[PDB]
RNA sequence: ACUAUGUUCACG
RNA sequence: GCUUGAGUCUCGUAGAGGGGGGUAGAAUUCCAGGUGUAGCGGUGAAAUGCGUAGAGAUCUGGAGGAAUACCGGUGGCGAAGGCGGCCCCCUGGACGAAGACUGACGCUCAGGUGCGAAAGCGUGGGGAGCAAACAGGAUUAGAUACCCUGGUAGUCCACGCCGUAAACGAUGUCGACUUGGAGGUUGUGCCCUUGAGGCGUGGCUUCCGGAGCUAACGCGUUAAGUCGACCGCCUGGGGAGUA
């Protein structure tokens, strides 16, 4: 459920929690975990390339399986786990042979359900297939952009691609943006919708909730001096210049798409 | 004229279209009761059977297809 | 939903007389036979019976003198919503003593005229003009 | 909906025989049987307000029979509730 | 609707159209018929019908015509 | 438990498969208590209008008694199958015979 | 197609 | 104690009763392309608007969303609000048939609870058409309108809130009783189905009328007639269903 917290303190007042009752309460499966040290937004050169990131809670990386390499092998969903490295939840899948892997939990899924993947299989939520084999006009997620790769598109909580059309070797997909992209039919896609759709109704409530998610404070250009940001200076709340990034490029309606290579695949741009 | 027959009763079925095509006009529309007789009960069974026959493309919805 | 059976009897009589009807069937009772006989004894009704064993149906036979009916008017006084018990001296006289008021007294059901002389009052059931 | 076998099972157990099927003991059990079947229906659906009016008829109807049965006889009233699981 | 009229004829004669649709497509689904207004304007077309039909029985008056 | 009347239509080129299709749909139902009362393969009958831009669909009428689990499993095998162009599943009112 | 207004009390 | 009230059981019939999930066809809109050559659009009459960048018209393929032509009626169902393509899933009631059972278990109901059109409101979607606001063009003495071209909230779905309408038969709920006629609709029994018959007895329902009632209009076995039970409400108009 989406439970609103009672106003016992200012900072608590506005908090809205997404309390999933079906998640596991305990330590995760270690073999799939590994360390994930933080950058703080800095790179090779030790310089802030991405602003406003740094701090937060320490969090380990779960090796989630996007490829779904196991063909013609059934797999029982053992337990749904919380993932700090992701918007969506994950499911500890135990394959019939012996292996265990983490996968993104679709919407219709619980501890006990069985999933199969490969070439044949059945058309059901969670069952990964080649997009050729999937019926046209169906809800998919964890969609590959290249055959044999992991899975790029629709991985966030409540996110899903819809297969619009199927032109021979190619499949026209309508993405969550509204962009209609043409991908290869040999590429795979996990059926259904990505779970944890309540995620968006979470509201943090306090400053520190953003700080313990690893975000840092965003200072407005207008607040700065002219030397710092193009917006800057003025003796008491001035502006009078067109909105811009700290590096002068115009924000607020200014197309930065310039790939050129992959412009053939885009059937129609978003709107 | 009226219904099926004197000792008919029966039920208006969608599968048969020979006797059923009499009750629709040339355009494809269902003909009303005030033109073809029929009790209100059998007109409703008919109207349903036309719509089921239309789903299976046994009868047409119209004549602009 | 059928709270007063006695009022219902007196409507069937009243409406039967309006319709110019000969006989008036209804479900019987102890108090129904007592009132019906008092109406008969003075002379509003011309004979009655109580035909039935398991489910008795008391049918009256209404009286007519001219084209006009005999029972000019008949109404419930001591209805169940408001019971009306009158004292010996306070007993009414319907139409200045040429119509009767059926009164349930301690010595059985009787008319208002007989109640005065007998020396007792009671529940005044219905005025009959 | 209550099938033929479901009613006939309750009728030939609480009452005297399959012949007897109108007792307050029987009547209340048939309502309790349907009311408990309808809980699974109103678990989801929820917006089915028209069927709820048919249920709340059955509920109130059952209370009128039990309140009758209590005033009529305290012995068989208390014994019926222990078996059906009412009172709550 | 699909009217050929053999070969020597021409002169339109397509009452098939005029006694089937036209009024249904046009003076009905042209502008907004406010849900309630049909229930009003039908029930007055319906009340006006039996008004005439009941009068037609009592139309045989003296006349002297 | 319940009687039904399945009337599905199949694509022309896959009408050779229909003999095979019927044997699988019979085997699903005939095992679970209720028997099929009357089959009747209609044949490659003309369409009143073009469905999916084609004419002549291969009609098949089963008419069968089954529980709700088996019939809804058969209902899903029509949607997840490109060969079958449409179908409908009617209700009870006893078994029947003849009529076309 | 659009197309406004007629001061107050009275006389019957 | 009893059985006619009330309720249960059997068996069928009808129905846009309800909730959830599918899918069908016509159309509209936009999207891409073919054809094609000046208009189209609209109106009382015009103009704003779209069009030589090739529109309109016409064709082909696609995406969407919402609504279900004809059947469809003084037809049906629902307590009221209300409810219409077709199909399954679960589901409430209604009516009839002849029995068996229970044995007055009933009728009303202040407080109280539940549902309750449309418009609103919150949150997340969705958005073709339509369309408050808004803009432009006409109209006009003026035109914050009516008419025209655009067009956002809304209208659609999931989950809550709102709690009102000329929520109207302007007619409280239950029961008894009192001449008729013409229909519709759904039953069920008896003879010959001896040919789309008839002859009966139940529900729901539209219209016209008798006595009676009514200020009159009208109502009239579904009373506003004749009575009973209980509830709600009324007490001149404005102030005011306001403070
Ligand atoms: Mg490790
Ligand atoms: Mg890194
Ligand atoms: Mg380095
Ligand atoms: Mg270095
Ligand atoms: Mg940056
Ligand atoms: Mg940032
Ligand atoms: Mg992070
Ligand atoms: Mg910020
Ligand atoms: Mg800031
Ligand atoms: Mg900022
Ligand atoms: Mg500052
Ligand atoms: Mg400063
Ligand atoms: Mg700097
Ligand atoms: Mg600068
Ligand atoms: Mg300064
Ligand atoms: Mg300064
Ligand atoms: Mg400053
Ligand atoms: Mg200043
Ligand atoms: Mg300035
Ligand atoms: Mg700059
Ligand atoms: Mg006696
Ligand atoms: Mg007896
Ligand atoms: Mg006796
Ligand atoms: Mg308790
Ligand atoms: Mg409890
Ligand atoms: Mg208790
Ligand atoms: Mg408890
Ligand atoms: Mg209406
Ligand atoms: Mg003036
Ligand atoms: Mg007895
Ligand atoms: Mg009885
Ligand atoms: Mg009864
Ligand atoms: Mg029953
Ligand atoms: Mg039944
Ligand atoms: Mg039915
Ligand atoms: Mg039926
Ligand atoms: Mg229905
Ligand atoms: Mg329905
Ligand atoms: Mg429904
Ligand atoms: Mg829904
Ligand atoms: Mg529905
Ligand atoms: Mg279509
Ligand atoms: Mg558009
Ligand atoms: Mg073109
Ligand atoms: Mg050209
Ligand atoms: Mg001009
Ligand atoms: Mg011009
Ligand atoms: Mg031009
Ligand atoms: Mg050109
Ligand atoms: Mg064009
Ligand atoms: Mg065009
Ligand atoms: Mg769109
Ligand atoms: Mg109606
Ligand atoms: Mg009704
Ligand atoms: Mg009703
Ligand atoms: Mg319908
Ligand atoms: Mg629909
Ligand atoms: Mg049901
Ligand atoms: Mg019922
Ligand atoms: Mg008995
Ligand atoms: Mg007894
Ligand atoms: Mg007995
Ligand atoms: Mg009060
Ligand atoms: Mg109240
Ligand atoms: Mg409410
Ligand atoms: Mg609304
Ligand atoms: Mg809203
Ligand atoms: Mg707001
Ligand atoms: Mg909210
Ligand atoms: Mg949105
Ligand atoms: Mg919104
Ligand atoms: Mg939006
Ligand atoms: Mg829009
Ligand atoms: Mg949108
Ligand atoms: Mg418009
Ligand atoms: Mg307008
Ligand atoms: Mg506004
Ligand atoms: Mg303006
Ligand atoms: Mg003027
Ligand atoms: Mg001027
Ligand atoms: Mg002007
Ligand atoms: Mg203006
Ligand atoms: Mg204007
Ligand atoms: Mg607002
Ligand atoms: Mg819906
Ligand atoms: Mg909604
Ligand atoms: Mg509320
Ligand atoms: Mg009100
Ligand atoms: Mg209304
Ligand atoms: Mg009305
Ligand atoms: Mg009414
Ligand atoms: Mg009122
Ligand atoms: Mg009322
Ligand atoms: Mg009430
Ligand atoms: Mg009540
Ligand atoms: Mg009455
Ligand atoms: Mg009669
Ligand atoms: Mg009659
Ligand atoms: Mg009749
Ligand atoms: Mg009648
Ligand atoms: Mg006859
Ligand atoms: Mg009747
Ligand atoms: Mg009427
Ligand atoms: Mg009336
Ligand atoms: Mg009238
Ligand atoms: Mg009348
Ligand atoms: Mg009558
Ligand atoms: Mg009569
Ligand atoms: Mg009548
Ligand atoms: Mg009668
Ligand atoms: Mg009657
Ligand atoms: Mg009545
Ligand atoms: Mg009647
Ligand atoms: Mg009355
Ligand atoms: Mg009056
Ligand atoms: Mg009051
Ligand atoms: Mg008051
Ligand atoms: Mg006053
Ligand atoms: Mg008040
Ligand atoms: Mg108000
Ligand atoms: Mg107020």
Curated annotation (Swiss-Prot), chain B:
Which cellular component terms (GO) are annotated to the entry? cytoplasm; cytosol; cytosolic small ribosomal subunit
What are the entry keywords?
Answer: Acetylation, Ribonucleoprotein, Ribosomal protein, RNA-binding, rRNA-binding
Q: Which InterPro entries match?
A: Ribosomal_bS18, Ribosomal_bS18_CS, Ribosomal_bS18_sf
Q: Which Gene3D superfamilies match?
A: Ribosomal protein S18
Q: Which residues cross the membrane?
A: none
Q: Does the keyword Transmembrane helix apply?
A: no
**One MF term in GO for this entry?**
small ribosomal subunit rRNA binding
Q: Does the keyword rRNA-binding apply?
A: yes
Its GO biological process annotations read: cytoplasmic translation; translation
Pfam families cross-referenced by the UniProt entry: Ribosomal_S18
Similarity comment: Belongs to the bacterial ribosomal protein bS18 family.
Relate the assembly described in the record. Answer: Part of the 30S ribosomal subunit. Forms a tight heterodimer with protein bS6.
What does the UniProt function comment say about this protein? Binds as a heterodimer with protein bS6 to the central domain of the 16S rRNA, where it helps stabilize the platform of the 30S subunit.
What is the name attached to this protein's record? Answer: Small ribosomal subunit protein bS18
UniProt source species: Escherichia coli (strain K12)
Report the gene name. Answer: rpsR
Curated annotation (Swiss-Prot), chain D:
Q: Where are the transmembrane segments?
A: none
Which Gene Ontology cellular component annotation is one that this UniProt entry carries?
cytosol
Q: Which UniProt keywords apply?
A: Ribonucleoprotein, Ribosomal protein, RNA-binding, rRNA-binding, Translation regulation
Q: Which GO terms describe its molecular function?
A: rRNA binding; small ribosomal subunit rRNA binding; structural constituent of ribosome
What does its record list under induction?
A: Part of the metY operon that extends to pnp, also has its own promoter.
Gene Ontology biological process terms from the UniProt entry: cytoplasmic translation; regulation of translation; ribosomal small subunit assembly; translation
> Any keyword Transmembrane?
no
Q: How does it assemble?
A: Part of the 30S ribosomal subunit. Forms a bridge to the 50S subunit in the 70S ribosome, contacting the 23S rRNA.
What family does the entry list? Belongs to the universal ribosomal protein uS15 family.
What function does this protein fulfil?
One of the primary rRNA binding proteins, it binds directly to 16S rRNA where it helps nucleate assembly of the platform of the 30S subunit by binding and bridging several RNA helices of the 16S rRNA. Binds to its own mRNA, stabilizing it 5-UTR and preventing its translation. In the E.coli 70S ribosome it has been modeled to contact the 23S rRNA of the 50S subunit forming part of bridge B4. In the two 3.5 A resolved ribosome structures there are minor differences between side-chain conformations.
| Name of protein | Small ribosomal subunit protein uS15
The organism's taxonomy opens as: Bacteria, Pseudomonadati, Pseudomonadota, Gammaproteobacteria, Enterobacterales
UniProtKB/Swiss-Prot annotation, chain E:
Superkingdom assignment = Bacteria
InterPro entries, alphabetized:
Ribosomal_bS21, Ribosomal_bS21_CS, Ribosomal_bS21_sf
Q: Which GO terms describe its biological process?
A: cytoplasmic translation; ribosomal small subunit assembly
- Renumbered to this chain, region (Disordered) spans 40-65
Give the GO cellular component terms, alphabetically.
cytoplasm; cytosol; cytosolic small ribosomal subunit
Q: Where is the composition biased (Basic residues)?
A: 43-56
PROSITE patterns of this UniProt entry?
RIBOSOMAL_S21 (PS01181)
Q: Where is the composition biased (Basic and acidic residues)?
A: 57-65
The keyword Transferase is assigned to this record = no
- Signal peptide range: none
Please give the Gene Ontology molecular function terms for this protein: rRNA binding; structural constituent of ribosome
Q: Which keywords, in A-to-Z order, does the entry hold?
A: Ribonucleoprotein, Ribosomal protein, RNA-binding, rRNA-binding
Tell me how this protein assembles: Part of the 30S ribosomal subunit. In stalled ribosomes contacts ribosome rescue factor SmrB.
Q: What protein family does this chain belong to?
A: Belongs to the bacterial ribosomal protein bS21 family.
HAMAP family named among the record's database cross-references:
Ribosomal_bS21
Q: What's the protein here called?
A: Small ribosomal subunit protein bS21
Q: What is the lineage of its organism?
A: Bacteria, Pseudomonadati, Pseudomonadota, Gammaproteobacteria, Enterobacterales
Swiss-Prot record, chain F:
Describe the task this protein carries out.
Binds together with bS18 to 16S ribosomal RNA.
- Domain of life according to the entry: Bacteria
In its UniProt entry, what is this protein called?
Answer: Small ribosomal subunit protein bS6
Entire-sequence positions represented here: 1 to 100 of 135
Keywords of this entry? Acetylation, Ribonucleoprotein, Ribosomal protein, RNA-binding, rRNA-binding
Q: Which residues form a coiled coil?
A: none
Which family, according to UniProt? Belongs to the bacterial ribosomal protein bS6 family.
Which Gene Ontology BP terms does the record give?
Answer: cytoplasmic translation
User: A Gene Ontology CC term for this entry?
Assistant: cytosolic small ribosomal subunit
| Species of the source | Escherichia coli (strain K12)
